[PDB]
Design a protein around this ligand. Structure first.
Ligand SMILES: CC(=O)N[C@@H]1[C@@H](O[C@@H]2O[C@@H](C)[C@@H](O)[C@@H](O)[C@@H]2O)[C@H](O[C@@H]2O[C@H](CO)[C@H](O)[C@H](O)[C@H]2O)[C@@H](CO)O[C@H]1O
Ligand SMILES: CC(=O)N[C@@H]1[C@@H](O[C@@H]2O[C@@H](C)[C@@H](O)[C@@H](O)[C@@H]2O)[C@H](O[C@@H]2O[C@H](CO)[C@H](O)[C@H](O)[C@H]2O)[C@@H](CO)O[C@H]1O
Ligand SMILES: CC(=O)N[C@@H]1[C@@H](O[C@@H]2O[C@@H](C)[C@@H](O)[C@@H](O)[C@@H]2O)[C@H](O[C@@H]2O[C@H](CO)[C@H](O)[C@H](O)[C@H]2O)[C@@H](CO)O[C@H]1O
Ligand SMILES: CC(=O)N[C@@H]1[C@@H](O[C@@H]2O[C@@H](C)[C@@H](O)[C@@H](O)[C@@H]2O)[C@H](O[C@@H]2O[C@H](CO)[C@H](O)[C@H](O)[C@H]2O)[C@@H](CO)O[C@H]1O
Ligand SMILES: [Ca+2]
Ligand SMILES: [Ca+2]
Ligand SMILES: [Ca+2]
Ligand SMILES: [Ca+2]
Ligand SMILES: [Ca+2]
Ligand SMILES: [Ca+2]
Ligand SMILES: [Ca+2]
Ligand SMILES: [Ca+2]
Lengths: 114, 114, 114, 114
């Protein structure tokens, strides 16, 4: 199944934050309405924040997370969770190798903000 | 029900990251085995990362998040999500006021690391 | 925080299914736009299905689950989870006593159907 | 990523329940330590509960859900969620066709019981 694709409410600010846990430099692309809206890159084996941004979900609310290591797409896993019918998390993990820890880049999207 | 309390695997490194979305200064305390292990403070209405740390779950694996705003405890909501049977997120939202957006401090715990 | 309250898409059919794990007879009320739309009641310590039904979320999409044991309201825990941006679960646990297993009535709401 | 595989606590009773939403007859297999422990089957476009059973997770705690429609394996999506650090749901959706509703067989595993 498709992973790393979320429908947010239209025209809504959201946070995106990426962490790294891999020997490889992670490249995280965040697409809004099928166009690149933010790109992060960094390397850490200690959960370093390689990127954090506030974006607008745009008129469609379509947000996609892609992860690559030296141009090779990582295998993604994802889910959305809503707490108390208000607080939204869109969560992505990614696997760049064979150990299947799925933490090589970790991306958290959260809304609403403010 | 109790919220903001999670049992991790023993002796396991985890990341904890806090975000703020409120007029009020958030204080986020992260306890391991009932002992303060990290404290973050800050004020943002735009999802600032008021802090991020790597901690060890220790012999009990017990991790608790507490949030307060000038010494008043915020109301918490929480859940844990596991992707592909391997990648763990422990999620907390908090409310300092009356609007019930539960984003006033947002805390994300993730493991495993590395 | 409020629990057992979910906003579904308007005018959308959903499944609601309850299970029991308690010495107490569980009463599960499902409200749609603040009106009782289904009531299940039953007793099991072995996860028996005490009721299943398909409802329509109506113009508001507001669905609420309440659980009581002989008119005593149970404490609830809840969350919504979305897989591959398509499949929705609204999950409720409930506690009627002192052991805090929160399984005394378990309610699963799922959509879309068909 | 692998989907429909969950590590439960060893030697623990759990509920497994399947729902159908498809023109195709669903077959759900539930494996415990890599051996078939339960098989459910039915055909519904209205969320019929085609099976529900209580199983034991056995010494490994490994539970796997597989879905097929006239011998063709369906594509799976899954996650586990934990509420109040106690109540566990392991969730599976499946796709037998081209519309990607992922509801064609829906499986819910819940523990603890009793
Ligand atoms: C792109 C990349 O560097 N992947 C492979 C490495 O595995 C990554 O980095 C390590 C440190 C872990 O974070 C992995 O989960 C991640 O996919 C790999 O590094 C080795 O991984 C071992 C477990 O897979 C173990 O941690 C070992 O200590 C570490 O060196 C290197 C070397 O095998 O190969 C890359 O292709
Ligand atoms: C600790 C504190 O200041 N809390 C209340 C204020 O609300 C907080 O800050 C605002 C900016 C939002 O992030 C709220 O979610 C958060 O709880 C509250 O401030 C007012 O909140 C309104 C919504 O309730 C709206 O954002 C408004 O613009 C903002 O000024 C003040 C006034 O009600 O009360 C505090 O309790
Ligand atoms: C409605 C009710 O009777 N609630 C409490 C009882 O506990 C319920 O039923 C038992 C079988 C468990 O499913 C509990 O999770 C559930 O809340 C409680 O019954 C006792 O619960 C013990 C564990 O707390 C244990 O299972 C024991 O066998 C059982 O008798 C009674 C008496 O403690 O109190 C009610 O409040
Ligand atoms: C196993 C099978 O028959 N799969 C496809 C059919 O779609 C399944 O059944 C329908 C009723 C829905 O529950 C689907 O989600 C499910 O995968 C499919 O039947 C047609 O599906 C349409 C949407 O793709 C629509 O629901 C229509 O009413 C129904 O006839 C058939 C024919 O397109 O193709 C199979 O692959
Ligand atoms: Ca890896
Ligand atoms: Ca890694
Ligand atoms: Ca607030
Ligand atoms: Ca706020
Ligand atoms: Ca109980
Ligand atoms: Ca019980
Ligand atoms: Ca389908
Ligand atoms: Ca279907």
């Amino acid at each position: 199944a498709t992973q790393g694709v979320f429908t947010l409410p239209a025209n809504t600010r959201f946070g995106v934050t990426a962490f790294a846990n891999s020997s490889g430099t992670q490249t995280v692309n965040v697409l809004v309405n099928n166009e690149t809206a933010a790109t992060f890159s960094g390397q850490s084996t200690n959960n370093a924040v390689i990127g954090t941004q506030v974006l607008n979900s745009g008129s469609s609310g379509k947000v996609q997370v892609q992860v690559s290591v030296n141009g090779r797409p990582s295998d993604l896993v994802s889910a959305q969770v809503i707490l108390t019918n208000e607080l939204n998390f869109a969560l992505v993990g990614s696997e760049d190798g064979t150990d299947n820890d799925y933490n090589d880049a970790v991306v958290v999207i959260n809304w609403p903000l403010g």
